[PDB]
Design a protein around this ligand. Structure first.
Ligand SMILES: Cc1nnc(NC(=O)c2cccc([C@H]3C[C@@H]3NC3CCC3)c2)s1
Lengths: 665, 133
């Protein structure tokens, strides 16, 4: 709370200056700690001001007026700070009524490839800055991977659905700016097996904790044992889950061995002691005979004959003392063996039923990373997990489509315009686009710089859907093959009667086999309308795209039928099934840190490209090709907010190169 | 520093299950068989020990003798002295046995007795005879 709340809400340390700011304000950071604290307050304040009302522009004067002394003494510093915030989209970003209207004459021409959230964010920002922006769209609609199905009152995102927490999330700002029906997620998810019978609390809780214990395990393997390379190859996350389940399965067997080996160690102490008891009884048996024979000689007897009866009597009671000591000991071993037979260790690490339910927890992981766990980097798959926003993840009730559509208000957006060639030279760029409907109609666009928000899957496409002239340097193309672009699809089931538990937003289905763990393994009730939404994660994703809507819808009813009874499952009125890998404007769903990749590859993706000099011997030129999109932001990948932040980011960096950065003096 | 609890991730075990593609199911069934072996072995001794139990049926109740409760005396009758020399001859120095045999004199008297009746009963000569066996 306070000014400091605004720094946290802007992803920024309230009491330290970022590497960003050191760049623009090296006088301050290298200077006395007092000025830093001033600066920091001025920043933190200004952020606040924007945040408390993000529907109107925050002009520099407005800022100064509300700022108080002694902080409002150095107008240059305040002006310096406010421009910096404005340039890099920390303030006056999104959709705001501007006080001072746009300068009528623009400076510079920038072509943006793709009207996705990264694209529009940059576009809005650049226009905002007085630049001539034009976005080229292959699709007939904006939002790219923010897709929303609409028919009558039916509404369901084929694309993003979830706003991950408003603590420090730029979407928090956007939602105040565009009315967004933000409904929370009730985390409670009941799991239903193949039979259609719910898994009992005992079981659900006991397998979920194993699952987390298993992750915590892979992390331990990765960091403390450095199990990251195996057979000259990077270790996948899935690889190491096998190796951890196997090692826990080995321990189960180990402890059964050690426990029965402790029965044999005691049964054999018994068998050896039984032997002594049986040999002593025979010895006793014959002693008795000797004593009775000696006792048979009736008195009066001479002393050697008296000594013999006494000697035999003494000896025999001596042996009867041994055999009594040795049967107290037999009682102890008999009970000790009895304990061991009753405290047998766990029969199995996990049952077939148990491990089928475990799979559904791996399907969740596969759906979060939109990829088989065998492709995730062990070391790095969760590298973005420190920057999680606080707060509970929400869903958009009126569809996520409204954000994108709201960002396009007032932008030159050419739809049905497929870029096919990007040509960039020392003197400027030209992009070649066709009209998607009749591929022959051809367009040429000239510009000072191109911002590329082509999805990573499009960029991966061989043979190239878009060729770059000159080709991208290998350092870029390599980071593109290295990185992973994965898949998850959705099935939208539209029904007239809500026939599920309306107080649970989401509920699972446990797949029959491991290889089919993600086939429709999770269902969502998010909407005021009666729509259940079925996810296809992991391997299932790529496979179900080769199968019909009907066949896919069938398996949907079936599962629904099983969990609710053939009776209450009406025929779905409208069916939509996404096929994102098939889509050529995406060729995937979102990025994931592939094994052998790292978070540095995202950094690579975002470094822009500077072409060679036209005339040899001419001075090193300006960079002309920039990259945005969810695959460029290393700390917030595969998310709508990450995309958006990357658009804001490039816009400021493009503005700094072509409008000049006056806030550095 | 250390794994979650119950997880048993030795540094040395991972290599063993990572050494080859089928190495995992190797070690895992190498123990599946070894467990069977012990189980087999448990049945056996359980039988062998069960057989021995049967033999010990009746315990030793029939071969037991009632205990004599005779008040220890301190006078040595000519008889008791004679019981003694024999007990030494067959026990040598087991003080308790000799006291048990006479069953009226005690270990102190018995122990004293060797030095009292010493040249008289040639105990040293006797004791050598006991040590011969
Ligand atoms: C309760 C819960 N808390 N968080 C939940 N969901 C997610 O974190 C989530 C779900 C789907 C996709 C992603 C993608 C951003 C993630 N890229 C990978 C996976 C983390 C690094 C995250 S479940």
């Amino acid at each position: 709370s306070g000014v400091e709340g605004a720094a946290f809400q802007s992803r920024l340390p309230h009491d330290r200056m970022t590497s960003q700011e050191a760049a623009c304000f090296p006088d301050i950071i290298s200077g006395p700690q007092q000025t830093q604290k001033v600066f920091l307050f001025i920043r933190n304040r200004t952020l606040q001001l924007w945040l408390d009302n993000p529907k109107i522009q925050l002009t520099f004067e407005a800022t100064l007026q509300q700022l108080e002394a002694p902080y409002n003494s150095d107008t240059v510093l305040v002006h310096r700070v406010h421009s910096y915030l404005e340039r890099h989209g920390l303030i006056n970003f999104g959709i705001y009524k501007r006080i001072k209207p746009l300068p009528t004459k623009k400076t510079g021409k920038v072509i943006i490839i793709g009207s996705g959230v990264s694209g529009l964010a940059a576009a809005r920002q650049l226009q905002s800055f007085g630049m001539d922006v034009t976005l080229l769209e292959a699709r007939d609609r904006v939002g790219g991977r923010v897709a929303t199905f609409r028919k009558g009152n039916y509404v369901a995102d084929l694309g993003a659905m979830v706003v991950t927490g408003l603590g420090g999330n730029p979407m928090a700002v956007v939602s105040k700016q565009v009315n967004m029906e933000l409904a929370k997620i009730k985390q409670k998810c009941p799991l239903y097996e193949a039979n259609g019978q719910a898994v009992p609390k005992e079981k659900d809780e006991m397998v979920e904790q194993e699952f987390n214990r298993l992750l915590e395990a892979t992390s331990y393997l990765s960091h403390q044992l450095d199990f990251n390379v195996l057979n000259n190859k990077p270790v996948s996350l899935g690889q190491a889950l096998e190796v951890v389940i196997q090692l826990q399965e080995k321990h189960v067997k180990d402890e059964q061995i050690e426990h029965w080996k402790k029965i044999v160690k005691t049964q054999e102490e018994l068998k050896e002691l039984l032997n002594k008891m049986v040999n002593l009884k025979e010895k006793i048996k014959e002693l008795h005979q000797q004593y009775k024979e000696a006792s048979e000689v009736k008195p009066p007897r001479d002393i050697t004959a008296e000594f013999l009866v006494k000697s035999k009597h003494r000896d025999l009671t001596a042996l009867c003392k041994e055999y009594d000591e040795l049967a107290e000991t037999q009682g102890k071993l008999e009970e000790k063996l009895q304990e061991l037979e009753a405290n047998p260790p766990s029969d199995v690490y996990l049952s077939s039923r148990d491990r089928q339910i475990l799979d559904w927890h791996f399907a969740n992981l596969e759906f979060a990373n939109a990829t088989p766990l065998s492709t995730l980097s062990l070391k790095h798959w969760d590298q973005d997990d420190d920057f999680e926003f606080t707060g509970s993840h929400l869903t958009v009730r009126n569809g996520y489509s409204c954000v994108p559509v709201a960002l396009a208000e007032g932008l030159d957006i050419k739809l049905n315009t497929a870029v096919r060639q990007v040509r960039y030279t020392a003197s400027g760029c030209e992009v070649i686009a066709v009209n998607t409907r009749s591929t022959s109609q051809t367009f040429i666009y000239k510009c000072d710089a191109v911002l590329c928000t082509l999805p990573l899957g499009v960029l991966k496409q061989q043979p190239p859907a878009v060729q770059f002239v000159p080709p991208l340097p290998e350092w870029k193309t390599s980071a593109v093959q290295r990185m992973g672009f994965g898949n998850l699809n959705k099935v939208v089931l539209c029904f007239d009667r809500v026939f599920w538990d309306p107080s649970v937003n989401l509920f699972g289905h446990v797949g029959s086999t491991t290889a089919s763990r993600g086939e429709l393994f999770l269902f969502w009730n998010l909407y005021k309308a009666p729509i259940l939404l079925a996810l296809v994660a992991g391997e299932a994703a790529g496979i179900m795209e080769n199968i019909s809507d009907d066949v896919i819808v069938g398996r949907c009813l079936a599962i629904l039928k099983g969990i609710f009874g053939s009776s209450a499952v009406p025929q779905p009125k409208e069916t939509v099934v996404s096929r994102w890998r098939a889509d050529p404007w995406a060729r995937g769903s979102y990025s994931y840190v592939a094994a052998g990749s790292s978070g540095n590859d995202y950094d690579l993706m975002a470094q822009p490209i500077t072409p060679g000099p036209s005339i040899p011997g001419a001075p090193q030129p300006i960079p002309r090709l920039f990259f945005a999109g969810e695959h460029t932001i290393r700390n917030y990948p595969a998310t709508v907010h990450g995309a958006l932040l990357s658009g804001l980011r490039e816009a400021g960096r493009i503005a700094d190169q072509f409008l000049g950065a006056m806030y550095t003096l | 520093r250390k794994p979650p609890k119950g997880m048993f991730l030795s540094q040395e075990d991972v290599e063993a299950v990572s050494a080859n593609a089928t190495a995992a199911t190797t070690v895992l069934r190498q123990l599946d068989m070894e467990l069977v072996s012990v189980k087999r072995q448990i049945q056996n001794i359980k039988q062998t020990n069960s057989a021995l139990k049967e033999k010990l049926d009746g315990g030793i109740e029939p071969y037991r003798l009632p205990e004599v409760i005779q008040k220890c005396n301190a006078r040595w009758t000519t008889e008791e002295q004679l019981l003694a020399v024999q007990a030494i001859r067959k026990y040598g120095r087991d003080f308790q046995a000799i006291s048990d045999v006479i069953g009226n004199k005690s270990v102190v008297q018995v122990k004293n007795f060797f030095v009292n009746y010493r040249r008289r009963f040639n105990i040293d000569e006797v004791l050598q005879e006991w040590e011969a066996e």
